Structures are given as structure tokens and as C-alpha cells.
Design a binder for this molecule. Structure first.
Ligand SMILES: Nc1nc2ccccc2s1
Ligand SMILES: [Cl-]
Ligand SMILES: [Cl-]
Ligand SMILES: [Cl-]
Length: 163
């Protein structure tokens, strides 16, 4: 584990992370996709061998020795708010199991279901709180990645609030 497990936020391309593994915001079919998933496919294309997995699950595939954790958040266009919320919480619980099994000291993680799967709603708080519920009992350094300058400030504020 990390000597003093922390949460941090960075506003940059997750394909440039400085962590021991990466979480992909994957689709269920292991397709190249858009956004985070596209960047992950360009950086670690070998990790898409048999990466398909159901909604609310995570499947790890190694790119050399670098672990890519394919986490499938719900598309809120298709799920009810209630069922979507349950699957989004579950995807993060599966990421915490994988991070623990791999024995990494750090992980790069995006906010699941906040982009093209958001059903056009702002889900920063909902997604980040499910990330915390899952990751709080792990001892990896967690580095949350975002693109938007206002999201960076709100994520930073939420981390600092609980410290
Ligand atoms: N290349 C990309 N990295 C990230 C990280 C966080 C959010 C969106 C994107 S798109
Ligand atoms: Cl960047
Ligand atoms: Cl998304
Ligand atoms: Cl963002």
C-alpha cells in the first residue's frame, strides 16, 4: 500500500498518468469508444483483448505488465435513475476489488458515467461519492482525472472537505 494513502485530482489526459495502473471508462463490448476509452485504446490497445464485461463490473487486462482495469458504468440514457445509481455504485466496488487484488500502490481513475453515459445530467457529486464509498477502505494512492477546469475545482474542494 501507499505509506499515507491519499486522494488527489489532476486535469490532464489519463493516458499520461504517473500511477501503477489505470481505470478505463469502458463500454460493455470492449470497443474503442470515445473520450477516456479512445485515449486508453490509443495508449494500451493490447489491453482490449477479451475486455468485454457487463454493466456494473470491472475486468483487468495487462498491457505488458501495466494493468488496465475496464470498468463499465451504466448509460443513464437506458437505465432508470434508481437502477443506474445501483450499477454505478457496483462498478466502483468492482474497481476496488481489482485494485486490491493487483497489489498496486496507486491508481489513475476517471469519474464513471459523467460524459457520454450521463444521460445529459451533471453527475460529478453522484459519481465521486460512489468512488469514495468503494475506494475509502483501499490503501492505494488514488489520482482522479478530469478535463473541465470547474470540475477540477469542485473535485479538489470535495477531497479537501473530508481531510
Ligand atoms: N484523454 C482523456 N483523459 C480524460 C480524463 C478525464 C476526463 C476525460 C478525459 S479524455
Ligand atoms: Cl493533457
Ligand atoms: Cl461516460
Ligand atoms: Cl471533466
Amino acid at each position: 500500500g501507499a505509506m499515507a494513502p491519499s486522494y488527489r485530482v489532476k486535469r490532464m489526459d489519463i493516458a499520461k498518468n504517473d500511477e501503477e495502473c489505470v481505470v478505463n471508462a469502458a463500454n460493455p463490448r470492449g470497443l474503442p469508444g470515445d473520450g477516456v476509452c479512445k485515449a486508453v485504446y490509443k495508449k494500451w490497445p493490447e489491453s482490449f483483448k477479451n475486455s468485454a464485461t457487463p454493466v456494473g463490473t470491472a475486468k483487468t487486462v495487462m498491457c505488458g505488465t501495466y494493468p488496465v482495469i475496464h470498468a463499465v458504468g451504466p448509460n443513464f440514457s437506458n437505465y432508470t435513475e434508481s437502477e443506474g445509481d445501483r450499477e454505478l455504485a457496483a462498478a466502483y466496488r468492482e474497481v476496488a476489488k481489482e485494485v486490491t487484488r493487483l497489489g498496486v500502490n496507486s491508481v489513475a481513475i476517471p469519474l464513471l458515467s459523467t460524459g457520454v453515459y450521463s444521460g445529459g445530467k451533471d453527475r460529478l457529486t453522484q459519481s465521486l461519492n460512489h468512488l469514495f464509498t468503494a475506494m475509502d477502505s483501499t490503501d492505494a494512492d488514488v489520482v482522479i482525472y478530469c478535463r473541465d477546469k470547474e470540475w477540477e475545482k469542485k473535485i479538489s474542494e470535495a477531497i479537501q472537505m473530508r481531510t
